[PDB]
Structure 1
Amino acid sequence: AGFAMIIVASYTANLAAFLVLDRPEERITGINDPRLRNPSDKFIYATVKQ
């Protein structure tokens, strides 16, 4: 039974962990977000012509 407790305990711990570091993405902040030093292909952005 001692072992038995550990299983469900660890289960709670892990499932909690999966919901705290569940941070999808940080929204881009200003010009100086260095993702916009040189961008990738998964993030498009521009201005209007002229």
Structure 2
Amino acid sequence: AFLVLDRPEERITGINDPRLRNPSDKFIYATVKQSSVDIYFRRQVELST
């Protein structure tokens, strides 16, 4: 039982993941300044946080 479920969890399901939809300092998001990704997030309504 200990060996079966000592499995770490990694980020999946893209930006739809609610486990880290709310920002916190433990994990860091990043992109490249002045790119298409910056325009996409800046022009999105729900993706403002």
Q: TM-score, normalised by structure 2?
A: 0.50
Structure 1 gaps of 5+ residues are 1-16
- Which structure would you say has the larger Rg? 1
Determine which structure has the larger helix proportion and give its number.
Answer: 1
Helix, strand or coil at the partner of 1:31:
helix
Structure 2 gaps of 5+ residues are 35-49
Letter in 1 for 2:33: K
Q: How many residues align?
A: 34
Query: How large is the RMSD of aligned CA atoms in angstroms?
Result: 1.6
Residue of 18, 22, 25 corresponding to 1:41: 25
Asked if residue 26 in structure 1 is aligned to residue 10 in structure 2, the reply is yes
- Pair 28,41 (structure 1): closer, same or farther in 2 beyond 3 Å: farther
